[PDB]
Symmetry: D2
Subunit: 231 residues, 4 copies
């Protein structure tokens, strides 16, 4: 079958395996820093970074019908200078090889008002299509999440996320954990790949600050991934 995996405890600046977009950049310290921030450490409004993984992923195969299974994990935080005023969020996702960034702020650089994406979002800001409070969601080829759940967030604290997709059931599952707070959320729903994405995709993250406010920074510290594409 087809196999791939990768794992990093830290990010190496100017690493030839990640592809950076927008404001996205890797620090000396070793963080994937998605959004732009002030020397004061403050986030800057209307910011938006994306970050891809160079090798492409054969997610499903047309001749054989075969569908991959896969899993991904990451350590991430966010910094919010004013917790009463957040936005806009962070997503993990999969798109097509030549994906460039869409709309910002509430679109988390993924969708536009009027392009073949599957994603899991961690939304901080209640848009028109949003539910109340921060949440986690599954976006299948659209920004209006097909399912959501509250997101019990904590500022400046480390979140450990885990995403799994089980080809067998077409069941995607996302869980988030604040060990710092012994806190946990889970969300699950079925998604069909064979019809919402292309045989080969690329993966990564997207994150966006407030359109008209700073909102919160979005740094990613670790990344892990593996996939299996049976014949």
């Amino acid at each position: 079958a087809e196999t791939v995996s990768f794992s990093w405890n830290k990010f190496v600046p100017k690493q030839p395996n990640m592809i950076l977009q927008g404001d996205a950049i890797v620090t000396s310290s070793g963080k994937l820093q998605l959004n732009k921030v002030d020397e004061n450490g403050t986030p800057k409004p209307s910011s938006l970074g994306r970050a891809l993984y160079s090798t492409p992923i054969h997610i499903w195969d047309k001749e054989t019908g075969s569908v991959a299974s896969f899993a991904a994990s990451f350590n991430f935080t966010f910094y919010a200078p004013d917790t009463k005023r957040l936005a806009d969020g962070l997503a993990f996702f999969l798109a097509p090889i030549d994906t460039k960034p869409q709309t910002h702020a509430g679109y988390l650089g993924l969708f536009n008002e009027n392009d073949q994406v599957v994603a899991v979002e961690f939304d901080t800001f209640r848009n028109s299509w949003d539910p109340p409070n921060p949440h986690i969601g599954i976006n299948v080829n659209s920004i209006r999440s097909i399912k959501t759940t509250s997101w019990d967030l904590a500022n400046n604290k480390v979140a450990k996320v885990l995403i799994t997709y089980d080809a067998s059931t077409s069941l995607l599952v996302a869980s988030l954990v604040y060990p710092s707070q012994r806190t946990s959320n889970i969300l699950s729903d079925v998604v069909d790949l064979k019809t919402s994405l292309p045989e080969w995709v690329r993966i990564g993250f997207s994150a966006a600050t407030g359109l008209d406010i700073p909102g919160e920074s979005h740094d990613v510290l670790s990344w892990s991934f593996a996939s299996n594409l049976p014949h």
Copy 2:
């Protein structure tokens, strides 16, 4: 370091790697059937099976302070002839090498009213120390769960469970999923091994029917496990 892993898609009757206790037995079909049932398929009250994995697990090391990390997964169902009347449940756990079964019914063969166990229970029946409704819990050296969460159960449907223990934080996390229902629960809390168990343990399951009612059968279909004990 120390490594171990194992994985089964099915159970082989009379397999020399699992140790059966009580009513516990493996069917031809390939199920680990924990509790006793009528030819009519019905569960029989005051039933109780346990099931262990032969090789012992070096969970932590005294000389070096080192603590393992580990993870386990399983497919399991339960059969309840009358869903208004359930009990008593199923636990996954770790105990000491020479562990034999404790009390039944509400003790899930793990504790006695007055012995060095860490477990995750899926309790169906509201005992004195229980919270309302079915739940999932973390029992550290006792039957009174240190944390719980609702358990969104479904009769006769397949549940996929995942348990992880992260030595780094001493954070144990349990999640359950009904893909059949696109349903999900998670529970997390910190637990100290070095003080609630012995350097070497054995793992397995325990399950129990109604004391005075049939309650529900408890079959396990798959098992997966892996551990890492750094130096």
Copy 3:
């Protein structure tokens, strides 16, 4: 399918996963010491230790015809007080669950002059059925190796061995390496399991000193193993 794996960088004295036989014992230092030795460090003639791994291994399945694949690695040395006078050797092997030791000296505790073993031997001493010089051999249900190759040995130096069995071809392959000497041997031949062993076996090592001379000590420092039994 069926999976198992284990890995140790060191041996823990009195570990409940290994089963010791004969003179076999684990030192404080962390070595699996197979044969008996003088305080002077000298080997003692007519010595013989064996060492097993507790969990049993489902090597092949009768109902389904399925055959495992597997691989094993180890760091081992030998100490010879007089290199002109060696014997008798070390083997790695697989036998049936209830295997106890056979004949010593030239039988490496595996065979008797007149019991269901597959093994790879590292023979130091030219017996009647031996080829000239030290060698490596594949013994299928007998002490008369079906194939051999020279063994370019070095006293007191670390050897890294690797053994692989490819169910697909029934091809067993053994390689030995002295990184200290940038030295290497390989041997390969086909072996049928389904007819030379039982569905379930146990694995381990066997080693033996000179019958009437000290010969050489045989210590094992690390062990690694993994198996896969498809359906």
Copy 4:
């Protein structure tokens, strides 16, 4: 640390993970076909293909001194229309990111008469610097192998190769196996990466036909790889 792995049972034509050079191309059948061949199936002289793996590999790290370990395996054949007349061979290797092909025929597209390569060659043709007979060799930053061993080749038969590099000893080991012939060769020597390659490299294969004769075709059927870069 840094981890990567990949595995293919077959090659997918026009796959976005492999980079093709020269005559190198992937067939419908699923073979990586390195050299050009006649409809009659014949190889064509002065042919030369190379093939790379897109993601780059962090082989060693300057700040931390750290060196990777790695391993690779492949199924490969060659077709020789006239076995008395062979050339020129196949190599596996690692080079720098922007590597393009060097000289052909006896240089296996790797070196030029007067560029930072480590490779393992399977040479069919006795050049000026060659030893007698086909052989296997380790080329550290040059075409004159630092070590060789006979290569017991068989035309049109499947060879299974395995390459390992153990950072701990700086010991590279290569083994080749013809299960069809129950045949085996091994070669090992120490190599310093930190001084013969760049922190980041790319890997692949190179293969070349006769300069003035057809020689032999060189197809690769499978590929496997994994690396670990500790901190």
